[PDB]
Every structure is written in C-alpha cells, then in structure tokens.
Amino acid sequence: VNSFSGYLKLTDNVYIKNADIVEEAKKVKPTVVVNAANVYLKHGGGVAGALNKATNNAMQVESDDYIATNGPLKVGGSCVLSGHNLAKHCLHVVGPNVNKGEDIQLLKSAYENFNQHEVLLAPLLSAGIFGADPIHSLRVCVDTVRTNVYLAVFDKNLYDKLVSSFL
Ligand SMILES: CC(C)(C)[C@@H]1CCN(c2ncnc3[nH]ccc23)[C@H](CO)C1
Q1: How many domains does the chain have?
Q2: Is the CB of 47 under 6 A from ligand 1?
Q3: Where in or outside the cell?
C-alpha cells in the first residue's frame, strides 16, 4: 500500500492520472520522481522546467555540478540526483526528442531505467515538447516497465484520449 490517490489502473503495475506532476510530487513526496531530462540537464521548459522552478532552481544548480563532473547523459540514459523538496530522489531520464531528430526506438531504453526503482511517479517520456506521440509512449511504458509506475498527465484532454484508446 502506498499514498498515491485517484489513479486509474491500466495494468498490474501501471497507473495513470490527470495531474500536475509538480503538485503530485509536493503532495505525495514519493521516493522517486522522474524528470523528463535532456542530456545536458538544462531544465528550461516542459516537465523539467516546471520541476526545477518548484525547487527554486536548486535542481539546476545540482545538475550543473553533475554535468561539470560527469559530462552529458546518453539519449536513453539516466542519473539519480536529489529530489529536493519534491521527492527523496529525482531520476533524470532522457527520452529521445523527436524535434531534434533522435531515434524513437531509444524510448524503450529510456523506460528501462524505471526498472531500477520499485515505485516511481513519472511523466510520459518523450511526450509534450519532446515531440513523440503520447499514445505510443504509454504503450512502450506498459510493455517495458515492470516496477510500479504512477503516471501524471498534465493535459486533461490528452488524459481522456490515453485512457479511451488504451488497449
Ligand atoms: C501533452 C503536453 C505536451 C502538453 C505535456 C507537456 C508537459 N508534460 C507534463 N506532464 C506532467 N506534468 C507536467 N507538469 C508540467 C509539465 C508536465 C507532458 C510530458 O509527458 C506532456
């Protein structure tokens, strides 16, 4: 039993809700919140910009030190950093950005990072400003993640389409 509330159950392990991931994280304080990161950990917009803003830019400061030490992530890769005031940990995961021409097959690799954590609050990878089809992202999530994932979908219209079209 966990403290996630109001989710629809899609499968044994995947749950979905129309919610602002920032507000969800602030309420639940999960062990792991997933960020829709880029390889440079430049949290300018989308989910990443919103999460970073909620940390008063502390996420960006920590991220800049991480990159200065380690260099960029791989597309499809991840790193674990602090969750600041939002969660214990933030799993920064790089889905392919279709608006940069990146290979959508890497979306499965990106979701594989979730399997290293028993429970996660997450957005749909490569959705929003990353340019991928969210219906496809949900399908890859369900077919790749085996741990317990609670998906927050900000847009109510998109949430309803994802549920109604889910196979
Ligand atoms: C569908 C659309 C492109 C409009 C969104 C954009 C951002 N994003 C978010 N998801 C959950 N919580 C969020 N909080 C702030 C942003 C955000 C989604 C990533 O799957 C896609």
Answers
A1: 1
A2: yes
A3: Host endoplasmic reticulum membrane
Pairing of strands 78-82, 14-18: unpaired
Q: Is 124 inside a domain boundary?
A: yes
Identify the CATH number of the domain in which residue 35 sits: 3.40.220.10
Q: E strand or H helix at 156, and its extent?
A: helix 156-164
Residue 144 domain flag: yes
Q: Which experimental technique did the depositors report for determining this structure?
A: X-ray
Long-range contacts of 80-86 (CB under 8 A, 24+ apart): 82/58, 83/25, 83/30, 83/32, 83/33, 84/55, 84/58, 84/59, 85/26, 85/54, 85/55, 86/22, 86/25, 86/26, 86/29, 86/33, 86/51, 86/54, 86/55
Question: What is the resolution of the experimental data for this entry, in Å?
Answer: 1.0
Cβ of 98 less than 6 Å from ligand 1? no
**CB within 8 A of 102, min separation 6: which ones?**
75, 96
Residue 123, domain extent: 8-163
121 part of a folded domain: yes
46 pocket-lining for ligand 1 (C-beta < 6 Å):
yes
Compute the distance from residue 126 Cα to the ligand 1 centre, in Å: 10
